[model samples]
Target: NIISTSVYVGPNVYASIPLIRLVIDLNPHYITQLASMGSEVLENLEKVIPTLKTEQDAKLQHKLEELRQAPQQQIGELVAILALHLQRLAGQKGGAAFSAYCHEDETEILYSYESEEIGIEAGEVVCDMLVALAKAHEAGDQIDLNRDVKGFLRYADRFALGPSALALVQAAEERNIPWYRLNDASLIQVGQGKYQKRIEAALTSGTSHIAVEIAGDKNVCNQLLQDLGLPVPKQRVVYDIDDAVRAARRVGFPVVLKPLDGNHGRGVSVNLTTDEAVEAAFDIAMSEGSAVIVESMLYGDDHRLLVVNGELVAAARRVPGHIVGDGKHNVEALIEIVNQDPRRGVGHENMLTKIELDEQALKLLAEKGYDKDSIPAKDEVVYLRRTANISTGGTAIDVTDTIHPENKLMAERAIRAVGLDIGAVDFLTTDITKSYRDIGGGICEVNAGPGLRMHISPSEGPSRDVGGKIMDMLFPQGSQSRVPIAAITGTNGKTTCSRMLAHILKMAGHVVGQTSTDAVYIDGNVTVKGDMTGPVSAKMVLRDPSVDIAVLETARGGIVRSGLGYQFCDVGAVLNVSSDHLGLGGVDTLDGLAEVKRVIAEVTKDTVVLNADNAYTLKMAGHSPAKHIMYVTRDAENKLVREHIRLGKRAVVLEKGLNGDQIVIYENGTQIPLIWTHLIPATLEGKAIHNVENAMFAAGMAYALGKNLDQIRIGLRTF
Candidate 1:
């Protein structure tokens, strides 16, 4: 009665329901109390409905209004309203919509979520939140809207990444960039196998750790730029308040004092003219980092220039958190109205960040002789913060078209000076149209892993494709980012076929990675021992930098336990699907086993090799999404093979030649003899029928991977 739960892990379905106890001991009292407080409940729901904040809120509000206008309504219908709202709430919070179904008994609720979009654990977590909401509602206690929703977000935050990271993913998807998650964390491998580049958020594999270290400290970065003869503001690092004042005095008055490694405008005090001002800011700066930077304050609008691969791609003019007075409202009312803009959201969740009256804002307002109650004339603007950072409620206006050529070149050169592939140059300039040299502006800081949201979704001017530029920088046009992969899966012959294919690829002048029952081999050497025929071995092979091509023996155990290590393979082959691993891992029938094996064919990107002589393998031809379905059989005159070849499909078969039992390939109705099976070592001079079939399948795989016929023949004869 108090709990209902559902657990799912790769079709391991389980559930728990105690309907009798709920009906006998719970629902009666809840129903009566709920019916008695039905009006109060509806009123309370109406009050809290505004907090739902989903796309369906309008329809839900209208439905609630209609329900209130109606004279009569069942308690179950009202409960359904709450349930639907909860479902939508969880859907919005977890980033996937879920369909809910109440069991016929009406005591158990089942939610079908998009596990492909979000993950299984996250889907279950949302389900758990839904149950918690229902239980809280049934218990007659009012829901603490923020508490429960924040609780959900707290659990979901483990997967929640930064806005820039999400933008990169969206950009990669738009360009059809092949990428997959490396682990439970945000480490993503872009491209395939040996040709991949790793990324964690905006930090790429090409980004040097020393570059991050240099760019992380403002003082060190400034000194490096200054030494390189780049335009940078003079600054000195200090640890004591007295020394901080001395440095500001030596640098001249109206200086900026901030922590050496502070970010997002934290612990920063700018435009200090007096010794007392420097003293006041020194403590704040010291609290933020071990050392403080005291530099001459550079005056002008804040401009962030994004540099990728030593090229300036985008620029933005940043404005600190402020509001324009309407003359009809006080500062408080004006701020609230400005925050009501639909674009503003919490942190980086949306295009613009919502403004808050924090200490910095309040101090700036107080210095301007205004309070939250102050009302200014129309068109008058009031500043709330001196630092212009998006994370501190600032807004960005695209200025890519107006930046001077010299400034752009300087930004490009500044990133190279810091030795970063991707960097953001923080510059202060009065007018971007004028050269920084003439306007007396300088590069203040070079930041690594810069946020892309400002340039991507700026408040004014055209939005630049910064994320796309980043992707292009990491992977240029006409670059090789995918290694050819041959994945073999079936009841038998998988290990043998994998090894044979690896040998063929090796003969083709590729460093091959192979996984079989014997071991995982890289470049013909054992890298991992034991029965390495699962996804783990596949990953071990793929992650090896030396492997140029991969041959993975995908067994049923790995497919049943975890999943395929890779997303899609260049060539996938099913030698023959028979009764194996049956009566285990929920596969009790032959059809179930074949269905499991069919996954290899389903995920093949280029070609799927099937055995036309086998009925189960022949049936998978209709289910495969591959571009080509190439069949293999011992008999060249097999009816299915002949029919398949007649349809302009490719196939490999054993046919009569001048030499007995020759392997022949048919493509576009043309037959070409590849090699004599009796000469192949793996087939035992054509004496073993199973080995000959295995040879045919291996040759088919190699040919499907675009290997030359001569290379296949040599590889087979050598084997």
Candidate 2:
């Protein structure tokens, strides 16, 4: 409401936390101005932070991590803490935010080049951001309080959070599925329309609304699973105290009572074997929700099975909180000791939940013939909970590998009947190794959008890597998640190499999009002119739907300024790593500059292309993450090239033939000739040695892209 005619834009920005507190403390007028402005800036920041982090952009990654790992309140609350703390810190060390405190009587405003946290450049980026927003507010510019945060964050930074989507954003990118931010929250849009999937944290937009509502209800989930012939214990949903007592008696004692709809261990009670326990649990559940469900208590440790797309990915056994005595402590003292484990925390910020003693703890201790003050002998185990909910300080042990296969099949069938793509099945069983058919066990509930942290970081046994399983289910192996992309970066010849590769791909009947220092071309049409060798330019080409192949020119300055345009490229070609972009962005030496250049190859997830002639470039082959490497050289007899070729490796070599010069592909101890350098127009009849190297590098890129010998030959002649 403060900004009158404000046109909120995503491309423009901004600060740290310490300054805002100072502004609020000093200024009498800017209270609402600073508060409202700070909130807007963070959500704007939220939309802008892309989550696809890269190895090269380590400097930028620090802040990204701080933002992503913010306290797990709602996203708004977490970002408010991060933005306030950061903006507050940035302002104190020289007033990047002093402008916000300026009044009608004040003539001066604060300005600084560097900040204690974000440095001069990014720090001022925040200061300038605050200044403009305040000015817009003064002039009565209209800015949406919520609707258009993502609209402006599209260009908020060189990078946002890694992949910037829900938790599955990583899963989507591991297989090259094209994704973009949705409203720039945790929501990410995976793939384009028709194939588009939107997700927020663990829940996807694909999950039917009806199924979620049905599964959230305890009684409905029971009846639905029961109708599907699923193994669920007999339960009755009752509203009143007398009815609840009757239900417990009918279920024949030792029954559990829980709310009709609740999650995260809230208002759920188990093992009520008497009238007093039943009445107490019934009151708790009734206060929590509309109704309470009472059922026979199944005898087993709680087991949670995660099923995604009709397959069981992970399973874990959850145990209620317990403390062992060393013969020197009572129940209360032992709980205090157990809660002191480093893994435990106040809430869900860490691996384990801190122990809290409430009604359940006292009741549990009473049932075991013990109370808070009662001391136990050494090795005595005292339980503090009636149910195994991790949020209630329970522990989990991964039994994924040991779980019976038939149990997995049953979980899948039970979930399919619910019509949900993702579901968590909780089963009560004594032994996971034994079949439920052979032994005796029962299903408790089928939860939608289950909590994965327990399985991911269990108290004992191997971590499930459940995030990886979700990725496998969402995008199976052998699926194409991204377009074929080739990237080139070095001291020189990258733009030429990029242009030549684009020409070759276009010649082979593909729509090519390429970014160079001169211009960004989309199928031979120039989209922009000048300085296209950066991440922003690289993203422009990738985001275009009309393009089939992407040939990008990666630059040191760009990588230093932001991270990579893409997190991982298909083929990253390091033409040569020499002294370039020196005395800038902290890259002062040949090695330092070399450090900047090698990020291109290091982040490559497919094939790495390096110049065999440059020792600095060739050394990066070992550090690369690519599945394969392709070396290019002017001299056919280069020691490493020859040695590499003899060992069944592929190399692009320039040899002096009876004609002008020959470009050959050597592999499996054989050299297959592709074309003459003199014949390629870019080579200038093989006279320009650097251009010849450029053409050879492009040829290597073509080979890495799976271009056959004939298509590559045709490309060389026509391009």
Candidate 3:
């Protein structure tokens, strides 16, 4: 029977017609049903066909025949209608909103419907029609003869007749989709479910070594790794007091109470030493988590091993301690004050997040017979927290070398455990040397993600090249990775000294990149302005890619200007800080200048080059965290030089000679001298102690960096 049916197809059904027809074409009955709808559609077509002239009818007939011959005819028609509706909608608010809600995949689908002129509602209707048609086709036998029209009615009710506006609002309210006022620039997706799909599609297609789900929970870490086919430790999840107690007994005493989904070590209590401590810690842990974990404490130093491509590239010891202030207020008040400080505040772009008064913190305060409201006397001190996490005002010390070899191995294992090619593995070990031994201390917890800031900051010992190391490990360096570096910084003479050092180093068969106040000379040619000496000077010098050695004059202005000085340097020289530009640009005192110069010392990894003649420089020697200190002085009779010689360390001493001036290397009471009569600059003769001190400091640094006495003598003369 050529029974005619007029079905109101929504935009979604029309858009998905190609797919729907493909499904329908696989079944003859479904095709027949679609043909019945088409017969009715043709009745309306006839009215329109009469309005068209002879040529237009011929064109229409040709298009109709082409569609009929298509494999997914129904799908093609639906797609055509959907495309038309979408095109119409695209010129309006609803269509734009739907487009915004489209993710990468959905956008691809939308692109398939580019010719649609319908709105979002119409698009939804078309989608509903396709779904209904598929369902009806799948349930062909169940289709009641009496309800033949009812199926079409159902499609209409589902897509065309339902309260679509209310549905859209409800979807928005439930965060199914993000929605906002549509404007010319309103490309923001307002629906939740839609954007998530887009994000998933993008992630599935993108090439990221690791994907971290940070909802402030560690379980997310486990879940992500699990999805990636990585191994995760067996976990006992507990909820509420009863479950926690049972789990603790099951896990054994000295259990760790961790918020199942917490991050940054928040609400994590290790080695619950007492029953009360465990119970209290459990409560705090549970507060942030729907579930808690009572795991056995992994004994070890909290070593943060940065692993890239299954290798232990860099690691640091995370010391969890609080800054103590002689109390005028309680711990809570102190934290509040700290949070308000300009250095610690959000406005200043500080790395630290403000400490919140969590349950455990408050309970600890109460243990000390104080509450959040309690104000302590001036001499009194209060503990903030038992754990040291950088996020909670804890400091991280770079102990890449201090990390036991076994611990390094364990950290690498943990990276493999998490199935990540690049990750920060946080584990604890007391005996890092024997980390793998069951008897020795082992991992505490493994972090799937680690921030680079802790490794970059020189708060404790040496600054590590964590980022560079990661990049190198992920993308191995080419022939140019092992570059030499000579960093020079002080209140004066850094520019001349760096340039001279670069010249000397270049003459020594090295291609050098020199950065100072005057200019940046690269491979004996000016690449950048010479007057660019600052903290960034070292970075700029190293960035040349072809540079064999980077000589940076880290000037006081540059130190402050660059924000961070050279993070890695083989040799460092601090000449002398005099009252040159004092009371200018807030550097109003020698102490400020000393603080500025100290950065160079802090950033120096192997050796710190200091002036023995300058008391200010000498005083700073004690403050340096460098493993070796190279003392250089221009004084022939300096007591400190004699003392250093007695101590068995090398000393560089410059003495006046009858020929001109002499450079003397004194070690263990033995001296090697070199005369600079022929090569000494005319301007350097009887120069200020500062100038001689600067040259000696640079020479000493070079010596410490493995230059022989002859090399030092030649470098000094040539420099």
Candidate 4:
């Protein structure tokens, strides 16, 4: 028996009423007899059919029709049978409604059934039973239920479920029933432990030069040297804390606490003055290693020697001093001022990694009865940390020259001790030239990967070209030659004049390398094409083996940009100092402008060329160190030329002859004529007095470089 409840059955009720009326009409004789017998079921069914009915009225009509269609006599028998089956299944009465009925055995049976008590709706129970019977014939599960029915009902009302349902369907189709059947064969050989397998593979391929080894028992310093074939220092290893204490007692008070695997001066405590301090330092050291080394504290100007491939590449004097601003406050305030510098800020640019207030520092402050908050008088200086690590706010200066030979030998020995091809050797000593015992100092530590920046920084003084030095050491002299170069600098005609000299050299059958404000021409062929003449331009010229003579224009910007010119040229030419490029680079005044141009003359050694007509150019003769000087002038009657000749100097005079024409020649006591009028083309505008002076200077340099009178005349005339 299937019972189903339907809401809003108005249409079904109307259709069913018509059917019932037709049935009544078809069985008219039977209906009339039954109506006369006072049967109220037919009347009730008739009352249900109205002109218009709501959903509730139509449902009642359907219920009345179902009751009227039932066979009255067999209903009691059917109820009795259902009641019997309910008793067999459980102690529950079963019937359409609660009723007492007589069975075929003439026994009265009470029948009662409720759909709510069955724990399932009547329609669902019927459908499940039918599905179970169909699956039984197929030899599948008797109760073939959709397990995802609950999930379906939960997500069914959602407006969007297509993507979610598709993912679920795919997962169901590809579900693995057994772990062995799972497709994870690719992960079977996955390496575990250290994820450095790729790095290890690279190392085993012999491409890597250095490797870090775990030296548990051996001294790491000794192990490093042994691995690299470096020299070994006289070192004693202490196995335990008591051994360290015994060694310290033997060595005397104030020892050093150092860890085995520590680097960059980390985990190192110096001057362990008291037993308590020693114990505390030892505790920190032992945290990094089971063994400890207590060595005597060495003292000196802490110096670092950087060596590459067994050569001393560079050195630095590491001074233990902090930068202090003039503070109205005391030592502590001064420290804060230094710490506030942008380069020493937290995490961003930390020169000093740690700034701990040691007892010495604290005691010094307390002697003044001052704390961090105490403000000293104006113009007070403060001392921060004592160690000279660059990161510890210490300034480093290049002291390669000042360091004693013995100290340099010690640094080299340290490098040899470390078995490394490249290393930074650190030492602490007083008067590096003397013996270690005399000054009570020695090597502090050896670093494997020292940063090259400190040695190359200009602020450190005469910066070492450490990067190039290292590259050269690794690849020894690989088919490159560095040659001597000449740099000419001044305002106005430096470009045209340098180019003219280069052209003369090129015409003289010499491979002349040239760089001007226009371009870089190498031996008559344009190598680098553009207006770029600086240190790099000069360096490129000097670095080329093909270039015999490099004629470069050293502008003030180039000199200042490169910090220092590479070489003092064979000849330095200052064409004419003028009021050009003023207000640039703080050269606002004429003297300032002259000083900028004079830098070129200051660096020259062989010869210095000057324009005698320009007073500013003439004034630079006294400042130059050139053994040979040449003064080029357009006026032969100039007073500067008389003074230059009186000083027994050579002069290129651009004189106007009796014919009222231009003539260029070097004049000592005799005139060696270079060229006369009609030699220079008239189509070239602005080639008058100034250009004649420029051409004469080039002619003098050609003569000075041992070019004959004919070569000079021919070179100048041809160009």
| Sliding window of 10 residues with minimal summed lDDT for model 4 | 15-24
Where does model 4 exceed 4 Å of error?
1-482, 485-489, 529-533, 560-565, 579-589, 658-664, 667-669, 682-687
What lDDT score belongs to each candidate, Candidate 1 first? Answer: 0.64, 0.60, 0.49, 0.48
| Tens digits of lDDT, candidate 3, 1-719 | 11111111111212211111122222443254553344333332223222212234322423442344223334424333333232222222212111211222122222232211222323334434443444453333223321432333343333331121222323333432223322212122221111211111001112235433331245555454344333234343444445455666665667777654434456666667666777777878777656566666656555667766555656666655433545556666677776675445341246555666776566666776776776766656555566545556535665667656665665666555545555566555565555355423344345554544455553567665544443333223342233345454454575556645655676566676655565666775665565453434554665455666666565555444342334445567777666665522665566666666677676566677777777877776676666456677766788877677788766777777764666676767577765453355522655444346556665665666556656555666664
Model 2, 574: alpha-carbon shift in Å? Answer: 8.1
1 against 3, candidate with superior lDDT:
1
- Total backbone collisions for each predicted model: 0, 41, 54, 10
Model 4 local distance difference test score: 0.48
- How well is each residue in 375-489 modelled by candidate 4, as lDDT tens digits? 6655554454445554554356656766666666666765555445555676665665564445454555665546554454523567665544544432234522223335354
Report the error of model 2 at residue 306, Å: 3.8
Q: Which 10 residues in a row give candidate 3 its minimum summed lDDT?
A: 196-205
Candidate 3 is scored at a TM of: 0.35
RMSD after CA superposition, every candidate: 6.4, 13.2, 30.1, 39.4
| Residue 719 Cα positional deviation in candidate 1, in Å, after optimal superposition | 2.3
Q: TM-score of the candidate numbered 2? A: 0.54
